[PDB]
Design a protein around this nucleic acid. Structure first.
Ligand SMILES: [Mg+2]
Ligand SMILES: [Mg+2]
Length: 136
RNA sequence: GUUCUAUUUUGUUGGUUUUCGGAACUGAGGCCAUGAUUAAGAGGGACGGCCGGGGGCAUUCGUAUUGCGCCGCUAGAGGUG
């Protein structure tokens, strides 16, 4: 729980995988390989109503909790892998992406590289909904 | 040339054969200014270099989706106005 044994003067790097969907936000810090989870706080566990799971306020609250727990383990800098739902469905990142990443930059973390890892398909299976679409 | 063959021919009655005309076939010739309109801003075809998500058969690659196995940390995740 103390963290890495290393002298100062260098950063130790983790990676946060941000999943900014339209229904909630996942802030999920892991090591370089991605195999070891270090802290996963979701935007939906910081609100009392499930209408606000995707709120930018929840994303800000989630990132602050992740950053504070990240400081405990000793990680100082993060690489960003922004991600929308992607795949067959919509590919634009949700409202929580902007606020979740801004919080990590204001909570003492150091931002490394930013990349987009949304899963675009070469072509996927037929999409949910009728031929007439989701009409309302 | 061959065949069939009308009738003028032999003084007046009978027999053959020509010529003579009519019909047919056939051999060797002369000659034509000897004999085929052009090649459609019609078409068919051949030929030459290309061109194309045209067609059929086989092969090869891609991420995504779903499902399963293992590993990590966690209490929520999904959807909706
Ligand atoms: Mg229906
Ligand atoms: Mg309407």
């Amino acid at each position: 729980s103390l963290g890495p044994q290393v002298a100062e003067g260098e950063n130790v790097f983790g990676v946060c995988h941000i999943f900014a969907s339209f229904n909630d936000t996942f802030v999920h810090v892991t090591d370089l390989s991605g195999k070891e989870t270090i802290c996963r706080v979701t935007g939906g566990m910081k609100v009392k109503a499930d209408r606000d799971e995707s709120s930018p306020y929840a994303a800000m609250l989630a990132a602050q909790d992740v950053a504070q727990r990240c400081k405990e383990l000793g990680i100082t800098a993060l690489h960003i892998k922004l991600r929308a739902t992607g795949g067959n469905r919509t590919k634009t990142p949700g409202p929580g992406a902007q606020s979740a990443l801004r919080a990590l930059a204001r909570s003492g973390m150091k931002i490394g590289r930013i990349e987009d890892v949304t899963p675009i398909p070469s072509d996927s299976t037929r999409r949910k909904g009728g031929r007439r679409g989701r009409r309302l």
